Symmetry: D2
Subunit: 131 residues, 4 copies
Amino acid sequence: AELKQEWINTAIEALDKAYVPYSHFPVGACLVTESGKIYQGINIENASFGLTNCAERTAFFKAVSEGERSFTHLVVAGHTPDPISPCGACRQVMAEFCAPDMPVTLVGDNGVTKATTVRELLPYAFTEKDL
Amino acid sequence: AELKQEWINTAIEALDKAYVPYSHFPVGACLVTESGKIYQGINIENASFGLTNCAERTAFFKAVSEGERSFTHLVVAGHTPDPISPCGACRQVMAEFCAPDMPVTLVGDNGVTKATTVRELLPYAFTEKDL
Amino acid sequence: SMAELKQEWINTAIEALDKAYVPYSHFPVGACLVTESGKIYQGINIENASFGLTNCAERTAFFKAVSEGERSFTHLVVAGHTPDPISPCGACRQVMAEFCAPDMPVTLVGDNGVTKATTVRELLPYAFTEKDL
Amino acid sequence: SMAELKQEWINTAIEALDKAYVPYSHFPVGACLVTESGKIYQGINIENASFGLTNCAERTAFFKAVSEGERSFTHLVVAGHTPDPISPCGACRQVMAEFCAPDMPVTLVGDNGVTKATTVRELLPYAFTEKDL
Ligand SMILES: [Zn+2]
Ligand SMILES: [Zn+2]
Ligand SMILES: [Zn+2]
Ligand SMILES: [Zn+2]
């Protein structure tokens, strides 16, 4: 799968921009469209923890608000010894908007990475089929 | 894996008790503790859709509020032609409280079932390790 | 008396502080939701390693009650280890508006016996409802 | 004038109604969040097949703005296709309290030009804050 350095940079650079005054645990994201346009995400906490929003979802909400519907890659980065794991809530938003086989790159500290896909992160994904 | 009919019944019976005035899409859950005690869950919607709570999480919140910390099975049921899929948010709550290999049974209409586990529904799960 | 019952509901909400699952914030919140039939449901906040999946004590109480078929609520008590009475967050206030009458009383509790009397409508003015869906 | 700028923010929030991702409720909500520097951020509600993962228009606007480093907000407009001015839900009100001054004005819009003037404090009285964490 294609992986551009600007996408890695976008997700890592977001770590310094996250709004995490309660966890001090920043997460950054780079969501790529078919046209090559990049959307950066950060996690954004709330004094009521349950209203916290993840970096991956921030990037999707940005892109989707600008009318983007065709996504080709997602990079997620953390200050973690192994590649950062997206939480299950984010995996469900990725399934809403991405193809099962759309590539995902997970990044940690000191250059560690893990290559995966939407389907491998959320197998047997719930969809709108039966609503 | 052990599977008792009362657990299937508990999840299916919950379908008639769900609070789903907006989707009319009921989901039911049966969460089993080590002691054999059963906790039933229903999905519970809100006029602001984002405040909706899933049946699986309702069962965990019930059990955890009573001090339960040892879970041995989860059944989830829907009025669906294939076994109901837990959403990614629920999968993340299951990972908070359950062993990776704890069995999960998914049920649909006309007796269709799917046997899986917490780890298979949420691979490479995010944990508190690096907070 | 209504004041004596309210003291027992306050005690239930305060006991919930010891039951909370808050390994990340270490900030417990307790709730006591009271039904028309006299049954009480105790709530705790329940955190998740992914903070956004945390559930508040008030919502835990409502989800417990609603899962048992309760639809008629008469009082809600919320307690924290706070110098002033604890404030319910906006998300909880929206779940209260889903299930409770606007004039339902809510009692907020802090440390050393401090309390504040309010209602669902006072906590969430001009509340969003299902009317236009 | 402040009233003329507010009309343009209202227009931005109303245009967002056409941009919303609401394939389940078919109930669009639009937002226009205004910064101290004059920059605006448009929000839409964005639903999910699992309803609980839906994000409101107001929060979409805040998450867009905060991700670009914005921390100083001067106005928020929220619009719906509603006969009375649309009400922000409690969850959105709590995110507004995280980032906005209590006296920040909020303009609520409905169909046929109906508006309601309020503030963050009026929408979320006795707001929960970080003070005790
Ligand atoms: Zn996440
Ligand atoms: Zn779920
Ligand atoms: Zn709350
Ligand atoms: Zn909202």
